[PDB]
């Protein structure tokens, strides 16, 4: 779930993906990438070979196991936009997220299935198409309910 790479110097790094990414769907966080290199010198230039110092190098190969970030337990995080209904005519279909089946009255509160159903005797905004997962799970859910 991580991408490793060398970036230019700075205090704010953006990260983007455009391969199906939303016009290159990107974010931008702050990250004080300042080159605190060893020795008196202050540049990224190996070529006149005089420098032989220790360096804390990032590993360039893939891992075997070093320490586990924990991904599991596919939850949701609060929304309002799961299912469809005109207040006693509810349509619940297959979905891209694990959508709980909620209504304003009756047994519609939950149920993370992608199963088609009509719903009466409930709420027009009261359809709680919930978030969940099955065979999924984020790391810690930082924004992430």
């Amino acid at each position, epitope marked *: 779930h991580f991408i490793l790479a060398k970036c230019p110097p700075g205090e704010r790094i953006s990260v983007s993906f455009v391969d199906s990414k939303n016009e290159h769907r990107t974010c931008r966080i702050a990250y004080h990438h300042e080159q605190r290199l060893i020795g008196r010198e202050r540049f990224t230039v190996r070529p006149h070979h005089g420098i032989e110092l220790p360096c804390t190098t990032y590993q360039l190969t893939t891992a075997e196991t070093s320490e586990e970030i924990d991904m599991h337990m596919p939850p949701d995080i609060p929304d309002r936009t799961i299912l*469809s*209904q*005109q*207040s*006693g*005519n*509810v*349509k*619940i*279909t297959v979905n891209g997220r694990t959508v709980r089946y909620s209504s*304003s*009255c009756g047994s519609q509160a939950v149920g993370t299935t992608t199963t088609d159903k*009509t719903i*009466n*005797s*409930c*709420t*027009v*905004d*009261k*359809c709680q198409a919930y978030v969940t997962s099955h065979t999924k799970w984020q790391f810690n859910s930082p924004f992430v309910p």
Partner: antibody
Amino acid sequence: QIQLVQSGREVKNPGETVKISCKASGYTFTEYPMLWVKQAPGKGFRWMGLIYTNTGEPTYAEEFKGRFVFSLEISASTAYLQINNLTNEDTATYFCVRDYFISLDYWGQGTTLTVSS
Amino acid sequence: QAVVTQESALTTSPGETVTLTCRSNIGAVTSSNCANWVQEKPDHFFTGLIGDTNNRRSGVPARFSGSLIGDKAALTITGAQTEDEAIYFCALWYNNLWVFGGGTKLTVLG
């Protein structure tokens, strides 16, 4: 569903709001939410909006937006599909309906208004 | 979001039925969409003869029933009795309104 009684034949001056009244009782007034009618005869199925308001989503339509604004004391399904900024072109049925059986299954009696300044 | 333009008379005879399909502009009228086709009456008629896109909706007789019919909310008026004249609204759903247009001239003879 929504047992809707409609408003009267309204008489509306120019620029005002003409609430097509609704006694949308017999069921939940949220169970039969604010399904507005703004139906002319040339319109047929005329825009006033739809709402089953059991969760609370009543909307004015394209015909219930601009000139329309859906309001109600909807506890007994008391409703006013208001011709808001209703000019001399305010003659239309501000009509009752309720969202249940996902179109206007429970329906109203209609409130046909003659708008004229 | 389509103004339901369709067969101009989606109506039948006395003992006769007319199965038209009034185009709400995306396709068939739906059930979670709530689009339909049915003879409702005039006079600010909050009553769906056929809504919910598989049969008659709430507030009308079920025989002038909604469908996903043709390219529209289908007004399959089977059971055109003596009182079968109305606005056969064939329109499409959006999950908030079965949007009809000017109405098919719904007829049951008699």
